[PDB]
Amino acid sequence: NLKDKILGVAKELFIKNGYNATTTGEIVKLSESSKGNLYYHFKTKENLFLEILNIEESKWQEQWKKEQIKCKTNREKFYLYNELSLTTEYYYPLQNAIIEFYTEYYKTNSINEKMNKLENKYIDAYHVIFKEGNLNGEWSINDVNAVSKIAANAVNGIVTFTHEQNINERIKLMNKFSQIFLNGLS
């Protein structure tokens, strides 16, 4: 493909290097396409990027759903999303470039929106897990969206700022977190 091979060469660079470090110039040399190509379907560079994120968030949200069946209760679902959060190959590997990208575009306006429309996807899983939990008496959440946002973000943190110490040390902590968090809800 073309408008899909670019979307893939970019992802690899955005991850390997960073948001800025990777240039549309580069993208082309390893994806063979006139500069203009990147223009029709991808307007700005924060377009091609804000794009990939969508794909990633979707792919991950999908992987989770074809994977949460292994969890009988929501308490189990919560626990599992956070673990899987550490192993996926989706979305999370791009948290870094996201951090950078937001620092180099917070001064514009179209940023706060997209960078908040996608936030609704990001926290969805937690909203479902938490609402359903109320619909199932596992706990009693009055401020679900508050709790869902706090959860999502907290977790992203553990996943993102412990990226190095042996992969199982992470899974350990992550579970202690899911533990403590839930015990604090009810």
Q: Which residues bind a copy of itself (CB under 8 A)?
A: 17-19, 21, 95-100, 102-104, 106, 112, 115-116, 119, 143, 146-147, 149-150, 153-158, 160-165, 172-173, 176-177, 179-185
Length of the chain counted residue by residue: 186
Cα–Cα distance measured from residue 159 to residue 169, given in angstroms and rounded to the nearest whole number: 11
Of the pair 33, 150, the CB lying nearest a copy of itself is at: 150
Instruction: Please state, as a whole number, how many other Cβ atoms lie within 10 Å of the Cβ of residue 22.
Output: 21
Find which of a copy of itself, ligand PRL, none residue 50 binds, CB within 5 to 8 Å per kind. Answer: none
Can you count the helices (H) and strands (E) in the chain?
11, 0
Element (H, E) at 11: helix 6-16
User: Is residue 56 at the binding interface for ligand PRL, with CB under 6 A as the rule?
Assistant: yes
User: Is residue 88 at the binding interface for ligand PRL, with CB under 6 A as the rule?
Assistant: yes
Instruction: Report the residue closest to ligand PRL, judged by CB.
Output: 88
Per CB under 6 A, contacts with ligand PRL among 100-119 are 118
User: Is residue 52 at the binding interface for ligand PRL, with CB under 6 A as the rule?
Assistant: no
Place of tokens 């960073």: 18
Here the tokens at position 135 are 């619909």
When binding is defined by CB under 6 A, the residue of 53, 123, 128, 174 that contacts ligand PRL is 53
When binding is defined by CB under 6 A, the residue of 32, 62, 67, 89 that contacts ligand PRL is 89
Identity of the amino acid at 135: L
Cα–Cα distance measured from residue 48 to residue 11, given in angstroms and rounded to the nearest whole number: 9
Stretch that binds ligand PRL, among 2-10, 25-33, 87-95, 123-131 (CB under 6 A): 87-95
Cα–Cα distance measured from residue 85 to residue 16, given in angstroms and rounded to the nearest whole number: 19
Minimum separation from the CB atom of position 98 to ligand PRL (A): 5
Place of tokens 């700022």: 161
Stretch that binds ligand PRL, among 13-21, 84-92, 130-138, 160-168 (CB under 6 A): 84-92
Identity of the amino acid at 154: A
Here the tokens at position 150 are 């706090």
Judged by the rule CB under 6 A, the positions of this chain that interact with ligand PRL are 53, 56-57, 60, 88-89, 92, 98, 118
